[PDB]
Amino acid sequence: ASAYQRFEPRAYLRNNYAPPRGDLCNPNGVGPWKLRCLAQTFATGEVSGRTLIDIGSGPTVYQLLSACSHFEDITMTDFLEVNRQELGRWLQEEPGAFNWSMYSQHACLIEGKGECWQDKERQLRARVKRVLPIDVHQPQPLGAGSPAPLPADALVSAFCLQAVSPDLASFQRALDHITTLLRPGGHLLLIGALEESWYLAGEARLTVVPVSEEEVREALVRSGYKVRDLRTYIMPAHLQTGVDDVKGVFFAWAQKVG
Numbered sequence: 001a002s003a004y005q006r007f008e009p010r011a012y013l014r015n016n017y018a019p020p021r022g023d024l025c026n027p028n029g030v031g032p033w034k035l036r037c038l039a040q041t042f043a044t045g046e047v048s049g050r051t052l053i054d055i056g057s058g059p060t061v062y063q064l065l066s067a068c069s070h071f072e073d074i075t076m077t078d079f080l081e082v083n084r085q086e087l088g089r090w091l092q093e094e095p096g097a098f099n100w101s102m103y104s105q106h107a108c109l110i111e112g113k114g115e116c117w118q119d120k121e122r123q124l125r126a127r128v129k130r131v132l133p134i135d136v137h138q139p140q141p142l143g144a145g146s147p148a149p150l151p152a153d154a155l156v157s158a159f160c161l162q163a164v165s166p167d168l169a170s171f172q173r174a175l176d177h178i179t180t181l182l183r184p185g186g187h188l189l190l191i192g193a194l195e196e197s198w199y200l201a202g203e204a205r206l207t208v209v210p211v212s213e214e215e216v217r218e219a220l221v222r223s224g225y226k227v228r229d230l231r232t233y234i235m236p237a238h239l240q241t242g243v244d245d246v247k248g249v250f251f252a253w254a255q256k257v258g
């Protein structure tokens, strides 16, 4: 955990959202795959409501590109101040903000509604009402009197739980904790690394729990979810770059049981 005090937003973005992993031209890449899972899930029209919360957003927003057109009140979160400040720079279009345009363009491409990427980013920025601190290790991850509308109609969490858990049990509890934020019958979109044990973020070296698809499924079930969809992307050699040892990426569409 204290290892996250050395976490460098720019280094994390560089490692994971800049070429090669950040080049979206090849459909077989991890970027396009993640956006497709998100887009396809929301296109079903079955994941809807008013409020949504992004768990452990870090300094990234790609994970809300397709989502933002389905929820008018969006809450982004992260444990680190530096990350909340990094997000702020993009949301407020401040100087030095990260360039997500490639991802916006591709979310527009995939969605196929003829929408220009600027309108997309406009909508995301418009619907993100607040960026809050969060600790998934606490029974109440957002705290006591959080400005976030609870319970949420839906939750999105990408590369967080597994990335902040040393073992499987921590992972399960973390899932339990965030699940309390979700209204019954609500929906969870979980994206995470498969069989990864570490990843770098500048001077920071994060040690994480290598999980499998079955282990992830079993966790969702234990937390009281119905798994609507669980998919795996196997990481191509070309995208294995020594910023980590991830073998694949999973996407889970879980619905909290009423």
Ligand SMILES: Nc1ncnc2c1ncn2[C@@H]1O[C@H](CSCC[C@H](N)C(=O)O)[C@@H](O)[C@H]1O
Pocket: 004, 007, 055, 056, 057, 058, 059, 060, 063, 078, 079, 080, 083, 134, 135, 136, 137, 157, 158, 159, 160, 163, 164
């Ligand atoms: N105890 C905790 N609770 C919630 N988030 C935590 C946490 N400890 C670290 N984090 C955050 O977990 C994030 C993992 S990086 C994930 C970034 C983004 N969601 C993605 O799709 O790439 C980091 O920003 C880190 O600050």
Ligand SMILES: NC[C@H](O)c1ccc(O)cc1
Pocket: 016, 021, 030, 159, 163, 193, 196, 198, 199, 244, 246
């Ligand atoms: N914990 C984040 C993990 O290292 C990761 C993040 C993003 C990727 O595309 C691949 C792997």
